[PDB]
Amino acid sequence: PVLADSFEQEASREVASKGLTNSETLQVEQDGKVRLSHQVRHQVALPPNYDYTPIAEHKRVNEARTYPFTLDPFQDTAISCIDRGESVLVSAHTSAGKTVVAEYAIAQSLKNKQRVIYTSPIKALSNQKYRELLAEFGDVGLMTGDITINPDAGCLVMTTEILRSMLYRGSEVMREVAWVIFDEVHYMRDKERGVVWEETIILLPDKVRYVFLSATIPNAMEFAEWICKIHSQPCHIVYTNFRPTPLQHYLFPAHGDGIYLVVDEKSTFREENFQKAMASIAKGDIYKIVKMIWKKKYNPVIVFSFSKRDCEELALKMSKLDFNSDDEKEALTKIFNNAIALLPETDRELPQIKHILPLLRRGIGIHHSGLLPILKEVIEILFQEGFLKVLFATETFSIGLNMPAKTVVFTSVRKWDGQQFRWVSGGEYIQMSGRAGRRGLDDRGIVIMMIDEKMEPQVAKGMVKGQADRLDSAFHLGYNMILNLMRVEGISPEFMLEHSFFQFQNVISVPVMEKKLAELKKDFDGIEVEDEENVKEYHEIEQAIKGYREDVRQVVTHPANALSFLQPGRLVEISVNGKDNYGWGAVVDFAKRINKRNPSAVYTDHESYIVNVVVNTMYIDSPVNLLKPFNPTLPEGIRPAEEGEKSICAVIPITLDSIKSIGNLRLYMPKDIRASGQKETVGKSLREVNRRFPDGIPVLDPVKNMKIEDEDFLKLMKKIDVLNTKLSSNPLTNSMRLEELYGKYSRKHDLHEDMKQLKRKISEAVIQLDDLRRRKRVLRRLGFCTPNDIIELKGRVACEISSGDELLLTELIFNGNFNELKPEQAAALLSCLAEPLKAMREIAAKIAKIMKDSKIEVVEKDYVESFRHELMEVVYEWCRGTFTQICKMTDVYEGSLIRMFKRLEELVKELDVATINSSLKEKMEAVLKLIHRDIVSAGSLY
């Protein structure tokens, strides 16, 4: 395919505000308004020799849909693609200003008595768009699993999954369908729902036209080419950095009194205001800012926290304040109780609505991942109406609601993940902050970023003036899809892979690699070194030496030997993960690693113990306030200081792989921790000891000190002497150029091994094929036949898609006909004293030996513990019947229930797809009755 018709256009709007500062933010226009611009870029991907007319030159004859306001060029061009009948992709921020474009496509379809599909990811947003489209268009139709009404329609709204099935099933409506409109296309990078999007598209007919709707996305021109490649047709892209109601961006430093406009409505980076801000460098800070905003009247606020545990402590500490808005509570309680009575009664009690309602009263709440879907949409409507003024809410919203604005306040600048404490990304920042600002209802949206760490200009420039995450494919070959590939005709797995966006992105990367591997092949074949033959043998010998003593380190540093040493004060040589030398330090303590985020986790012998060390070589700006206990993942920003930087004393966690050597020395370690100078004094002792051994600290001899006398060990040391001989005995007896000719050849060798690894990434769809090949090799040993056609067992999967592992579950059926009180062991596969949990584990490892036999991933415990015993006895007791009792048996939020209830249940119950093991199909309808009625009519529409 071919790229053409590229152009940028400028556009500018008018709004004036001083906001949260002392001065007016922008140089003012006479009206009291402010002239602000935004750019809007377009290009098209065209098929070879396609007769194209430049979209700028186009004139629409017949306005399908007509609009009251002046359209924007980001809109106006998309609409001319649609009217040229040329697929178009639009990314802009969720002003949902995109809607204008969709509305046009629809109306254009129905004007032509054609049919057109509108897909969103989620059943709910299907209803919301449905109601919206219904009110404007009439013959609209809704297809969820949940709801399905007037399908004999011309405008059909369906979940993305619906469509997937329909393309796989009878391409039925499809025949009359002109345009398919994908909302929230950026969801395709999701590791989960992200394959649905890709698959679906891939399936679709080269003859249907597309309208893609995205949030802003860096490279989307890679997306259109793909469409232009696989549905052989023109695809336009339409991007804008437009912001519906401009944003302002403050840092609130944590000593906490002054507040600094850091990025403007341009976005001009207020560099000076910033460096002022960093200079003025944590519970109560938040209250100060909470009160401040209700007082400064930037009225409703989402206070983003990254954990559930934070949103709950911080929403209640502001439940002291706005217990007012209570002449408003003289109205609130009523639509809030439009609910609790709609409940089952026993499931209407409990610490559920308890608490909550003062916060409701006090114009406040929290935001789940733990509440109830109605508990949260009452809130969402409480937020819609602004009855709640501060919701202490979490990163993650229902994918994705509509939310009140004016005020967005990050409680932080960092995110955990077990545990990197890492900076918010460019991407994360745009989404979360994207919530501040309301159309018309706000002359500006406000972003306030509680910072608490010295942070470089280019770091924050990346975070506050960054871009959104790449759309990168999330495709991969799952079984219950391979089968469906196999069965229905015309459509090979091998056709899917070659057609995936994934293999596409990979296809583009290859000329990229080539240009550099060809750029590196000029440079390795550019460095020529004298007596290369003589240098080499010398270079290799020194490297063989390098490699053996590494083997030695691995022994010493091993927990069988090391641990018996290493008392507080032990001197240790730190090179963490091999790249961060922090030199000598002293042991504070150590501990068996306790991986809490993952129960069934396995660690190396070296990675299995965590060591605390005082080092004094720590870069001074390292946010050492961030590293957590016995968690040797050192946050980005925590580095050792290099030649000519300032240092400090810190206590860091390491693994035994971070240890370069154990000294034969112990200094004094205060058991009084790092308490008020205690770690600094040790810092002075390290300074002393490091000054007392400039050359180095005497290392413990493995043999004379550590009683290490393995036969295997000694032979290693012997090899070392053997080399050290041949090496010394080399005619680079101080060759006067030894450091010059080594350096010259080492660069040659470094570039050589690097040209190898880019020679490998290069040349290799041919990557995805193996899992395909290997999944069939697994599959044939089971349910598909050996010529790769679907047999019986591949009926006991292929139709599923909601598989809690479709193959361990298909295999337990044709084997284990249990009782009634014990088969709640589906908790073991769908949640992520008398036990039949060995029947799945004896069956798994065999299945997992196959997955090992067909050369896929791993059997060993990780496949066997892939199916979790953790909450196996909890969901087990629920099979015997209170809602309030079961919640006393462990520690999982009451929102984990309506998911896993509908996730352990929806696993047991879609077995639609036409009959039979009798004893199953009956004792299991019972299995479905003993849990549904305990929280009966799930029921949740709006």
Numbering used by the authors: 79 to 93, 95 to 360, 390 to 872, 875 to 942, 959 to 1007, 1009 to 1038, 1040 to 1042, 1044 to 1045, ...
The publication says:
Regulation of this activity involves multiple protein cofactors including the Ski2-like RNA helicases Mtr4 (nucleus) and Ski2 (cytosol).
Recent crystal structures of Mtr4, including apo and RNA-bound forms, and several related Ski2-like and DEAH/RHA-box helicase structures provide insight into the general features employed by these helicases to bind and translocate along nucleic acid substrates. For example, conformational changes are observed between the apo- and RNA-bound forms of Mtr4, including the ratchet helix. Even larger differences are observed in the ratchet helix between the Mtr4 RNA-bound structure and the Hel308 DNA-bound structure, with the Mtr4 apo structure occupying an intermediate position. These conformational differences may arise from the fact that the Mtr4-RNA structure only includes a 5 nucleotide poly(A) sequence while Hel308 is bound to a partially unwound DNA duplex with a single-strand that extends past the ratchet helix and exits through the base of the structure. The primary base interactions in Mtr4 are with E947 (located on a loop above the ratchet helix) R1026, R1030 and E1033, occupying one face of the ratchet helix. The direct protein-nucleotide base interactions observed in the Mtr4 crystal structure suggest that the function of the ratchet helix may not be restricted to RNA translocation (by analogy to Hel308), but may also involve RNA sequence recognition.
